[PDB]
Protein: Transcriptional regulator (TetR/AcrR family)
Amino acid sequence: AGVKDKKRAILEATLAVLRERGLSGLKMEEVARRAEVGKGTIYLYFRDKRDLLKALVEERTWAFYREVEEVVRRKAPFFVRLEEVLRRRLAWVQEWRGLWAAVAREAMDDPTPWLKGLHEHYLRLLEELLRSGQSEGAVRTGLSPRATAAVIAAMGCTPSVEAYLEHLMEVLRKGVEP
Amino acid sequence: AGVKDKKRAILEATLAVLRERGLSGLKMEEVARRAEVGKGTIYLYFRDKRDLLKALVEERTWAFYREVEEVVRRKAPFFVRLEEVLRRRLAWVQEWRGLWAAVAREAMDDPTPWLKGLHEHYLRLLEELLRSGQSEGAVRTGLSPRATAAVIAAMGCTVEAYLEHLMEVLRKGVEP
Structure:
């Protein structure tokens, strides 16, 4: 009588299939097989396929934010946490471009508002990080956490890495003026 | 009277037809009509509808670069030029998401190789601007022009209070 287990198996199997055949090759038969459940069984946990994909992308996204939140709240210097958040964000943008964007579209008919909410949540996490830096003396108190979070959140549309990140951190810390 | 002149007239007519009929309603016949050239002329210049759209994105893009190249080589303070370039870049990205992205996509099976080539021209222009800023004394000489150009290209992704705050971070970061 285990549902938490089965539901999890279906979600992990779905991710595996996608990471294997991409959204285009996804067949519930392989998901059901990898999950070790009947195909009809999956429809007892999820309305349909797009409903299942929706649960998977939401869970993956929830996980990314749980990780960022953990980094932001760790007892560590502002600049170490900032660099850790940016590295994770960069990895996430790549995973999103390569899979979740298509999944989200397929899974939700009206995803734009959900996406806006995620962007707002990311901004709040960076503002929280910035306020911590202000209290630690790493960030100028004169800076608006909100406005500064929006600027930092801007990474993600350029393919430009380790070297790269070090230069970005240098600019975020000191800017370019002598 | 001039290959590049007729090419241009054809592309402008193409954009007109696209804006008032969509790609679905785009016919070479209709483009030839607005461009005032024979249908054969259209096909000589552009083999298929796909090469027509490709040429269209290229023209608008190279026109963007000339706009940026103009600010970059302008005799003005480094930060004045940087903000101008970034303001123009933002307007361009908006323009791109609203149309050019889809056009590029229809232009060819795989746009990326060609689009990466564009990211390049912009990067070279930022590098040139940064080297200028370094001679000017507005940009720390220890910064790598290439690396910093890559950073600015990124940080420049998309009310507009945004620009003023972006400039403050680009100029002095967040550290006291």
Remarks:
- The helical segments of chain B are 3-21, 28-35, 39-45, 49-72, 78-107, 112-136, 145-155, 161-172.
- Chain B has one domain: 1-176.
- Residues 1-176 of chain B form a domain with the Tetracycline Repressor; domain 2 fold (CATH 1.10.357.10).
- Chain B has eight helices and no strands.
